[PDB]
Chains A and B, each alone.
Chain A
Amino acid sequence: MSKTSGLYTARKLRTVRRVNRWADKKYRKAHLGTWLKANPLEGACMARGIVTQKIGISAKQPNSAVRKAVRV
């Protein structure tokens, strides 16, 4: 039946779901813990810092512009 049935298979049905849950990129990003470590804001809405420089950044292929930004 491509999935196990039977009145005494709750343990298997739970193990399969626990294992295959990690295959989703959304769940893995939000639950693994590496993104929390690598996040510059450390899981916060906002953060304060001091400006170290002023810069201009080229746009991508179909557009043409110089966007204005700051290294913080």
Chain B
Amino acid sequence: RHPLRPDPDRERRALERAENLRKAAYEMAENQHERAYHKQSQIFQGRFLRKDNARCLRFYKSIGMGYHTPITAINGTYIDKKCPFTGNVSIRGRILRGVVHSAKMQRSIIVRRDYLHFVQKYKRYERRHKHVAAHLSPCFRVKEGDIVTIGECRPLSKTIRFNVIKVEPVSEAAKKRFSPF
């Protein structure tokens, strides 16, 4: 890391995101409808009592492969052990793209992938599709029709082996087409 930190003079003020995260943590403590207190495993919970600010209050990482961390994950207040940026999982294996078929589950979506199958006797093709279940971190929000890029992780449920890592929005009320990519 050859270069070192150019000089803005509003940095320490702009770290008011510390009180932001702190009061979000203290709001989670008051929602007595919950049964478990949710917290990241990478973070002490004694760093919140301190005032010198010297220690970070939220954990995040980079996933590699030229995919950059969204700022909504860096400055969010949610808890997700299955989020690839702020949870306890990793991305490795195949990386694919598809379209959102359904977003009706809890932090889970269905993805529709399209492809062609050649039949040699008839010298022609047929159009085919498959459905893939994927995990949706709160740092993204999607609707049906949007393009997504998903990447492989370890097994996460009976049907899920992938995680949403990029979103390309698609306007509502547009003609739905084959769109293989």
Which A residues are within 8 Å of any B CB, using their own CB?
6-11, 13-14
Contact = CB atoms under 8 A, between A and B. Distances in A.
Contacts of B126: 8-11
The 9 closest A-B pairs by CB, nearest first: A10-B119, A10-B124, A11-B126, A10-B126, A13-B122, A10-B122, A8-B125, A10-B125, A7-B124
B104 interface: no
Which of B119, B124, B127 gathers most chain A CB within 10 Å? Answer: B124
15 contacts: A6-B124, A7-B124, A7-B125, A8-B116, A8-B125, A8-B127, A9-B124, A10-B117, A10-B119, A10-B125, A10-B126, A11-B126, A13-B119, A13-B124, A14-B122
B119 A14 contact: yes
B150 to A, nearest CB: 26
Interface of B: 116-119, 122, 124-127
A15 B116 CA distance: 18
Contacts of B127: 8
Which of A7, A10, A11 gathers most chain B CB within 10 Å? Answer: A10
A52 to B, nearest CB: 53
Contacts of B116: 8
A46 B124 CA distance: 46
Contacts of A6: 124
Contacts of A11: 126
A9 B119 CA distance: 10
Nearest to A11: B126
B67 to A, nearest CB: 34
A9 B124 CA distance: 7
Nearest to A8: B125
Contacts of B118: 10
A7 B127 CA distance: 10
Nearest to B123: A10
Contacts of A7: 124-125
A4 B87 CA distance: 53
A9 B118 CA distance: 10
A7 B125 CA distance: 6
Contacts of A8: 116, 124-127
Contacts of B125: 7-8, 10
Given A7-B125, A8-B116, A10-B117, 20 more contacts: A6-B124, A7-B124, A8-B125, A8-B126, A8-B127, A9-B122, A9-B124, A9-B126, A10-B118, A10-B119, A10-B122, A10-B124, A10-B125, A10-B126, A11-B126, A13-B119, A13-B122, A13-B124, A14-B119, A14-B122
